[PDB]
Design a protein around this ligand. Structure first.
Ligand SMILES: [Mn+2]
Ligand SMILES: [Mn+2]
Ligand SMILES: [Mn+2]
Lengths: 496, 494, 486
C-alpha cells in the first residue's frame, strides 16, 4: 500500500582500456538515460545513478553498500563497454539485493556513415553484456535479463514491472506475519517450515494467542469505532435492516472494534500480514470478517486457518501491484459450474475476501449466520468479483524446498446474481481449461488457498521466484498436462 | 498403552521334504516359549508358523502390517529360505523387522552330523541369503546374531521389542499443542507434516481457551482429594500445609493437572506442549501439573516444542518395564572444575519427578517471572546418578536428525537451597567441552529428553525404524571424526 | 605493511529476562572483551560491538561487518537464550568468518546463591545450543570453541582462529601477478582462475615478462648500491655481478607495490628480457612477506602469501617448497625439500646464509645469484592446494624437520630435511592418492588446525596427513569427502 522509500541503483560497466574521454562519453550516455527512465515509468520508485564502474574494488564496494543500505531494493547493471567479469566476481558474490542485467544500447540505429573505431570501443554493449552474462551463469546468480533499446516501450514496461517486483521482494525479505492461533487442525498444505521460510524469503512468522488480540480489542475507543461505522455507512451499502440501532448494527460495530484492535496490534508490531483461525477464537464475539476484508483492502496480507504462506504471498502480491488498478485478494476455489462454453469456478473464502477485486459498484455490508467457529452472526462485505485477465498463485512447502504455482485465469462477470449466497464471490474460467487447469494444479499440489490478482503479471511472480530461489511453475493458455507432468519431474530434480 | 505382540517367523523351503519342516516346527515351538520367558511376559511373542511359500510369506507380512497389535516381526531362516519368496512380503511389511541370525543347537554334534543335520541347521547361510535381500531392498532391519539362549541375544531382543513398541506408539502418537512456538525460536520450529510422514505424529494446535474450558468445569471434589494425594506423595513447604494463598496456588496447579488429564484423555493425546507466551485464562504456568503428567507417562516440552514432547513420549514408552525414568530437559548452567566439570539440567518448572533421587520431592511455590503470572506450584528435587542419555530431535529442513549424548548423572555434593526448580547434574561424555562442541556442531536443541532407562542402542534402533540419521556423542566421540561423520551422513540421508 | 584488522565481539540475548539482566550481560561482556584482548595479546584487536536482542539489530551488525573491510571475523556468544530466528536474516548476509564462542561468565556454580534470576542470565549452555542449531540448519561456515573465557585452551584457539581469519581476509582481497604462463605441459599448475576468485577471492592476473623487463631497467642504481650494501651485512656472501638479483628484487618490488600485489609467480620457460632467473631477489621478496611459486604456480603462490599472513606474529617462517630427493635409512628415513633457487630464508638454521652463484641449466640464462642455507628443525606443516576441476582440495602433511647430519658442499641450493608423518612410505602414498602437487608451502609456524579452519572459511575440502593417518582410512575419507564436496 505505502511505507518505506525504495530506490534502484543503475550501474554501467566499462574499463580503463579506452581511457577517460570514453569513460566521460559512457558517463554522459548514462546520465541522459537515467532521468528519462525515471520520469517515464517512474515517479513512484527512485532510480539512483551509482556511476560507471571500471575498478574491481569500486564494483565490490558498490555491491557491499547496496547490500548494507536497506533502501536499495535492487541493482540495474548495464555493460556499455566491455567490462571484464573477473572484477564483478567478489562484488556479485557480496550483492544481497536483486540484480537486473539490462542488456541495452545507447544508440537505437548504427550511424552507417561515421562509425570510427572510437564508436566500436564505446557502444560495444552487444558483447560486454555477453561477457558479464557468462559470469552470471558461471556463478549461477539469480538475475533478470532485459534486452533491447532503453527508450523501447517493451523495455521500460519490463523495468517498471521488475522494480515493483524487487520492492515486493525487499518487503518480503523483512516481512512480519502475526498468526492469531495455529493452523486449522489436520490440514497439510496450510502447514509448513516457518524457519525454512525465513531462510528462503526472510518472513518473520510468529504466533500470538487470540487472548493477545482480545486484549487489543478491549482497549479500542468506542469513539474511533463510532467514527468507523460512520465511514462504513458512507462507503458500503449496509442491508437496510442494519442502519437503525439493532443487534445487526451492534454486530457491525463488533467488526469495527475487531478492525481497530487488529489494526492497533498489527501497527504496534509492524506486521504487514496476519492469519486468523476459526478453531481458536476465545474472546472474539465473532469471526474476524469485515475487519479482515477492510484490512486486506487497506493492503495487509491475510489468510484463514493459520495459512501464513498464502497470507505472506498476499502482502507480496499487494505490494507487487501498488500503482496498477487490478486489485489482489485471498481466494479459495469453492464450487465448479460445468457448461459447454461457460466452464466457471466460483471462488469466495469462508467470508474474508478483499474488496479490491469487486466490480464498479456495491460493496453490500450483510450479516447472515455462520456455523464455522461457533460464534455470533459475523458482519461481512458481499460483492460480485470484477472481470478480466487475472492470476491465481499458491505457495506450498514440499519439505526440502518451496514451489510457487501460478494459474492465469480470466475473471467473468456473473450473468446470474445469487441472492442466498451471503459472502463475496468471483467467477473465472481457468486457462487453459477448467479440466486441465485443475488436473495440473492437483499434480503440482497447489493449496486450496490462493492469491487472486488482476494487477500481478505472471512475469512478476516468475521474477520474484527467480530472486527468492524457488521453482515457479505456471499453468496457462499453453499448458499441456502431458508436458506439465514432465516439467514437474525435471524441476523437482533441478531444485533439490 | 495397547497390548502389543511380536510375530516370530521361521523361513524354510520344501526342498528337504516335510519331516525336516516338522523338525523346524519342533525347534521353533521350543524356542518361542523360552524366548517369551527370557524377555518377560510384558510384550507377547506370538509363534506365526514356518514360512516356505512366497504366497504364505506375503500373507504373513500383509497381516502384520494390517494388525495394529503387531508391534514388530522377528524373522529367522532356520534352513536356506530363497529370498525372492520374501521380496513381495518385505515390500508390504510396514512393521519393524528383526532378522534374528541364530541356530537351535549351541554346539556341532561332531559324532552324528550327517547330510540330514546339514540341510536342517543351515541357518548360518539361510540368514545370509535373507541378509542379502535386506541389503538389496534397503529394509530398516535390526540384525541380532548369536545363539537364541545367549543372554546378549535375549537382552537385544528385549530392548528391540521395547523400541519396536515405542515405534508403534510413535506411529499413531497424537500431540496437542496449547499455543504456538516461543516467538523467534528456531530449533523449536519444524515441519509438522514432514513429521507425520516420517514418524506418523498427529501434531495439532489447540487454543489455550479450549483448555481453560476443561479447567473451568473440573470437579472441586476430585481437586481436593488430589491435593490430599499431593500432601501424601510430596513434602509440601510448611506455608502450604495450612490453607493460605500458597496452598491455593498448589490447588490451582491440581486444577490444571485434572483439566489437562481430562483434555488429553478426551483426544487420546499421549504428548502435549505449553508455551509461557500464551496463558490467557490460566492463573499460572502449568508446573506441578505438567511434572506429574510427565511422571504419568505423558510426553511434554515447553515453549511449543512438539518435537521434544513427542520424543519424550517415545523415550518413556521405550523404558516401560525398566524403572530408570525419563524427563524433559534444558542444559541450563555449566560448572567448570579441573576434575568436576558439571552441567545443571532444569526447566522453568517442568522436569519429570521419575529422574528424582529417593528423597521425596519438595512441593514448593516460589515466584516465576517468565509468562508474568501467579506464583506457580512446582516439585523441586535433585536428579539421581548413573549412566543416562540426552536426546534431541531437530529438523534440518529436508530431514530430521536424532542427536544422542551419553552422559553420567551425578548426585550434588553441595545442596542448592535457593534454586526453586528441580535440577539434575551430569558429566556429559566424553567431556563437557567436547560434548558441547559436538552437540553445537550437530545442531542439537537446548530442549532434550533426559532418560536413565533408554539405551543409545534403543534410540539408534528407533532411528533405524523411522529412517532418520542418528548421531551419537559418547566416550568414543572425537570432535575431528564427528564433524566428518556429520558431513558424510548429510550426503547419505539427502 | 599489514592492513589493520579487528574482530567484532558480539553477545546474544533477548528482552525476555527483563531489562536489568541486559545491563548484567553488558557488564559481563565489557569485562570479558578487555581481558580477552589482553589474553590474545594487543596484536589481533578485538572490538566489543554490543549486545544483540533484536533481529533488526543482528541484521545491521552482520551487514556492517560484511561492508567494513577492516572486520576480519566476528565472535558470537549467547550469554542468555537469544531466539535463533532473529539471527537468520543476519547470518545469511554475514560474509565474514564466524567463531561461535560457547562460554560462560561464572567458572563455578554459586551453589548457595543460585536464584531464578541467576538461571535467567547464565543460559549460554542452552542459548548457544539454539544458536548452534540455526548454524547447522543454515550450513554456515562456523568455528565452535567451547570452555570458560579464562581457559588458556580457549584463548589459544581464539588467537589461532584470529590469525587464520586475518589470513582469510587477506585471501579474499589477494591479488596475484603471473610473469608468464605455466610450464607448458604441466597439469597441477593449471586451474580455474575464475573458480579460485569465486572460492577464495584471488584476482590472479597474467602479465608479460616484457612488463617486468620495462620495470627492472627503470630502477635507481643508487638503491641497487644501497641494497648490495645491505646484502654483505645480512649474508656472508662469497668474494664478489650479484647486482642483477638486487636490480630484479627492486624492479619486482616496484611492480608488486604499484599493482597492490601480495603474491606473484615467475616461470623459467619465459625469461625473454631477464638476464637470469630471479633467485636471491624472490627469496628476499618472500622473506618480506610476498607469496611466490615458480613455474607460474599461482595456487602455491596464493597459498604461500595466505600461510605467511597466517603465521605473522610467531617466529616460525613459511617457505615455498618442492620435495626433491629421499634418503632411505633404518630409522633416519628423511626427505630433502628445495627449489631451483627460490627458498625463503625464514626457514634457515643458525643464520649465516651463504650467497653463492653457481650455474643453473634449467633457465638457459646467466648463472643466477641465490641464498643457500640449511633448513631449520622442529614440527612443521607441508601444504599444497590442488584443483580437481570442479573444486579445490587443501592437502596438509605434518612433518618433523630435522637438522642435517652430513654437510652438502656441492649442493648450490637452499634445502631443508624433514621426516614426514606417519612415515615417508605412508605420507607419500597418502600424498599421491590425494593428488598433492610437487610444489608445497612448508611452514614451522602454521598449525594444521589453522589450515583446516581456513578451508572451513573458504568452503574447500582440507585433507590432513599426520601421525594418526592410515592409508586405508585416508582412501575412504577421500572418496566420502569427494561425494560431500561436489
Ligand atoms: Mn480456507
Ligand atoms: Mn525451554
Ligand atoms: Mn618447481
Amino acid at each position: 500500500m505505502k511505507m518505506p522509500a525504495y530506490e534502484f541503483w543503475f550501474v554501467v560497466g566499462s574499463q580503463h582500456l579506452y581511457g577517460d574521454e570514453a569513460l566521460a562519453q559512457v558517463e554522459a550516455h548514462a546520465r541522459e538515460m537515467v532521468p528519462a527512465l525515471q520520469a517515464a515509468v517512474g515517479n513512484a520508485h527512485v532510480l539512483r545513478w551509482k556511476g560507471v564502474l571500471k575498478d574491481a574494488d569500486e564494483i565490490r564496494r558498490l555491491c557491499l553498500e547496496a547490500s548494507a543500505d536497506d533502501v536499495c531494493a535492487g541493482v540495474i547493471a548495464w555493460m556499455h563497454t566491455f567490462s571484464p567479469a573477473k572484477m564483478w566476481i567478489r562484488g556479485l558474490l557480496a550483492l544481497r539485493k536483486p540484480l537486473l542485467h539490462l542488456h541495452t544500447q545507447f544508440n537505437r540505429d548504427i550511424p552507417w556513415d561515421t562509425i570510427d573505431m572510437d564508436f566500436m570501443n564505446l557502444n560495444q554493449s552487444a558483447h560486454g553484456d555477453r561477457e558479464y552474462g557468462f559470469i552470471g551463469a558461471r556463478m549461477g546468480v539469480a538475475r533478470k535479463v532485459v534486452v533491447g533499446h532503453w527508450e523501447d516501450p517493451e523495455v521500460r514496461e519490463r523495468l517498471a514491472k521488475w522494480m515493483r517486483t524487487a520492492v515486493a521482494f525487499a518487503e518480503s525479505r523483512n516481512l512480519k506475519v502475526a498468526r492469531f492461533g495455529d493452523n486449522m487442525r489436520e490440514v497439510a498444505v496450510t502447514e509448513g517450515d516457518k524457519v525454512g521460510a525465513q531462510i528462503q524469503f526472510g518472513w518473520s512468522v510468529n504466533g500470538y494467542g487470540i487472548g493477545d488480540l482480545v486484549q487489543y480489542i478491549r482497549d479500542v475507543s468506542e469513539q474511533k469505532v463510532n467514527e468507523l461505522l460512520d465511514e462504513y455507512e458512507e462507503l458500503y451499502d449496509i442491508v437496510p435492516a442494519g442502519r437503525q440501532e439493532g443487534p445487526v448494527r451492534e454486530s457491525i460495530r463488533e467488526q469495527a472494534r475487531i478492525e481497530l484492535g487488529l489494526k492497533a496490534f498489527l501497527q504496534d508490531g509492524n506486521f504487514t500480514a496476519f492469519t486468523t483461525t476459526f478453531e481458536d477464537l476465545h474472546g472474539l464475539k465473532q469471526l474476524p470478517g469485515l475487519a479482515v476484508q477492510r484490512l486486506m483492502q487497506q493492503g495487509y496480507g491475510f489468510a484463514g486457518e493459520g495459512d501464513w504462506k498464502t497470507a505472506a504471498l498476499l502482502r507480496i502480491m499487494k505490494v507487487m501491484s501498488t500503482g496498477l488498478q487490478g486489485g489482489t485478494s485471498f481466494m479459495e476455489d469453492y464450487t465448479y459450474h460445468f457448461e459447454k462454453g461457460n466452464d466457471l469456478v466460483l471462488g469466495s473464502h469462508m467470508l474474508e475476501v478483499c474488496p479490491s477485486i469487486a466490480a464498479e459498484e456495491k460493496p453490500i455490508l450483510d450479516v447472515q449466520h455462520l456455523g464455522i467457529g461457533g460464534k455470533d452472526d459475523p458482519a461481512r462485505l458481499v460483492f460480485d468479483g470484477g472481470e478480466g485477465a487475472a492470476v491465481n498463485a499458491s505457495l506450498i512447502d514440499l519439505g526440502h524446498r518451496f514451489r510457487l504455482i501460478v494459474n492465469e485465469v480470466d475473471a467473468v462477470k456473473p450473468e446470474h446474481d445469487m441472492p442466498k449466497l451471503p459472502v463475496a464471490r468471483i467467477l473465472w474460467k481457468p486457462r487453459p481449461s477448467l479440466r486441465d487447469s485443475a488436473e495440473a494444479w492437483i499434480l503440482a499440489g497447489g493449496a486450496h488457498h490462493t492469491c487472486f490478482s488482476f494487477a500481478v503479471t505472471t512475469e512478476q511472480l516468475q521474477d520474484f521466484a527467480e530472486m527468492a530461489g524457488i521453482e515457479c511453475v505456471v499453468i496457462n493458455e499453453h499448458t499441456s498436462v502431458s508436458s506439465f507432468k514432465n516439467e514437474l519431474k525435471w524441476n523437482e530434480v533441478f531444485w533439490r
